[PDB]
Curated annotation (Swiss-Prot):
A motif (NPxxY motif) lies at residues 330-334. GO terms for molecular function: 1-(4-iodo-2,5-dimethoxyphenyl)propan-2-amine binding; G protein-coupled serotonin receptor activity; Gq/11-coupled serotonin receptor activity; identical protein binding; neurotransmitter receptor activity; protein tyrosine kinase activator activity; protein-containing complex binding; serotonin binding. Its main location: membrane. Changing residue 82 to A: Abolished binding to serotonin and psilocybin. The gene is HTR2A. The record marks 149 as: Hydrophobic barrier that decreases the speed of ligand binding and dissociation. Residues 65-73, 136-152, 303-310 are extracellular. It comes from the Eukaryota. It comes from Homo sapiens (Human). This is 5-hydroxytryptamine receptor 2A. The keyword Cell membrane applies. Detected in brain cortex (at protein level). Detected in blood platelets. Changing residue 316 to A: Decreased ability to bind serotonin and psilocybin. Coiled coil: none annotated.
Length: 355
């Protein structure tokens, strides 16, 4: 007789319906057809699967006093499905943070799908010892008739390899991606004060030497952010030919072209930083919500005999559901911090599917 199962039934439904909306939005909405959102759909499938396969069986054990209700050889399957989905969710978030950083340092839907299949095939290979060595020995998967990973070596290896190692790569790549966009917003501010300064130099000039010098330093700055460079080179031969006046009215024609490319590359820097902040919330919530479970998991092993393992087991039964609540909160962030997901989720609820 448990009041917990009611509270846990809400978490299964918000998981399933929330993440169905995300899979529907990336499949259907043409504004969301980029590589990041393809990883977020794949993550949503894992969340939905966690709420279909893992979370209802977890609710069932609460209803049988943590005694394993199902057939014994279904224990290792439930432990494999949960760890498979949990390994995929962290290695996806690592693969997003990694893939976005490379993109800043670099200039397809198949390009993304190949990365996603790689992450899933890695997460199948990692989780493989759980049934291979646990369907053979129930000792590794049972503890006083309770289905939990009981093998301490699998817990330790599994905690770092499945959770801590990709977390570290993710928290490094997120920092370096923020530092990359602060450099690119900074480098674009610098070239503005090169271009804006030499447009003021050209309209003060008496002689062809001052315009040719200032057009030369405008072209150099033009090279860091093609139309502008050619337009500048066009005004240079005017200044080389000594046509100062002709050069001076040529360079205020550049001024309408400079604003057009400065505010385009500078809107798109601001869009990435807005997007980086939204993924950061997604990253922050996965670490914080799963941290109590994974730390307790380790202290259960470290103070094996020293600590009250009845209480430490009772803390895990709470903390595993804080992390299950994380499945429900990817799609709420998407509502609150993206107009494209919110508009999509609005139409899907009112049952309009046309874009
Ligand atoms: C909030 C995030 C970042 C971390 C939270 C971890 C907390 C909730 C966990 C991790 C380790 C846990 C402790 C591990 C060991 C023991 C000794 C045991 O005899 C009583 C409970 C007690 C004292 C636990 C209390 C809860 C605990 C402190
Ligand atoms: C992007 C869309 C889909 C990616 C695939 C998502 C589907 C992932 C399902 C998990 C899976 O493939 O399970 C493997 C199996 O359990 C091992 O034997
Ligand atoms: C994942 C690969 C392993 C899956 C194969 C193991 C399934 C075991 C199973 O279904 O066992 C139930 C049976 O009723 C018990 O007596
Ligand atoms: C060539 C060497 C072969 C030696 C075979 C000895 C068999 C010993 C028995 C059991 C486990 C041994 C292997 C454990 C490897 C774990 C690797 C892994 O990724 O596990 C993750 C964890 O299980 C969840 O996340
Ligand atoms: C919002 C819900 C957040 C909490 C999720 C359910 C917590 C719960 O009931 O966990 C089982 C209980 O702690 C032990 O039987
Ligand atoms: C309700 C009881 N269940 C369900 C099978 C658990 O104890 C799960 C055990 C896990 C676990 C142990 C040890 C190492 C690990 N790496 C990654 C995970 C992991 C996933 C982690 N899940 C989220 C809970
Ligand atoms: Mg200046």
């Amino acid at each position: 007789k448990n009041w917990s199962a009611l509270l846990t039934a809400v978490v299964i439904i918000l998981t399933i319906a929330g993440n169905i909306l995300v899979i529907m939005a990336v499949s259907l909405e043409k504004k969301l057809q980029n590589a990041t959102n393809y990883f977020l759909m794949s993550l949503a499938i894992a969340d939905m699967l966690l709420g279909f396969l893992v979370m209802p069986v977890s609710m069932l054990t609460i209803l049988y006093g943590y005694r394993w209700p199902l057939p014994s050889k279904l224990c290792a399957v439930w432990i494999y499905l949960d760890v498979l989905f949990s390994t995929a969710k962290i290695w996806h978030l690592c693969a997003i943070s990694l893939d976005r950083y490379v993109a800043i340092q670099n200039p397809s839907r198949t390009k993304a799908f190949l990365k996603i299949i790689a992450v899933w095939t890695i997460s199948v290979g990692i989780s493989m010892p759980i049934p291979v060595f646990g369907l053979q020995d129930d000792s590794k998967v049972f503890k006083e008739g309770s289905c939990l990973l009981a093998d301490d070596n699998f817990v330790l290896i599994g905690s770092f390899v499945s959770f801590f190692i990709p977390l570290t790569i993710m928290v490094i790549t997120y920092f370096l991606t923020i530092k990359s966009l602060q450099k690119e917003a900074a480098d674009l501010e610098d070239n503005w004060e090169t271009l804006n300064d030499n447009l003021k130099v050209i309209e003060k000039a008496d002689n062809a030497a001052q315009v040719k010098d200032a057009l030369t330093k405008m072209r150099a700055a033009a090279l860091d952010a093609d139309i502008l460079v050619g337009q500048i080179d066009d005004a240079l031969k005017l200044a080389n030919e000594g046509k100062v006046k002709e050069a001076q009215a040529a360079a205020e024609q550049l001024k309408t072209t400079i604003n057009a490319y400065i505010q385009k590359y500078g809107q798109s820097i601001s869009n990435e930083q807005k997007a980086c902040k939204v993924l950061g919330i997604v990253f922050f919530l996965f670490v914080v919500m799963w941290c109590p479970f994974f730390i307790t998991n380790i202290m259960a092993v470290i103070c094996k005999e020293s600590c009250n393992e009845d209480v430490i087991g009772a803390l895990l039964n709470v903390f595993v559901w804080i992390g299950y609540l994380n499945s429900a909160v990817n799609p709420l962030v998407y509502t609150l911090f993206n107009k494209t997901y919110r508009s999509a989720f609005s139409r899907y609820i009112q049952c309009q599917y046309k874009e």
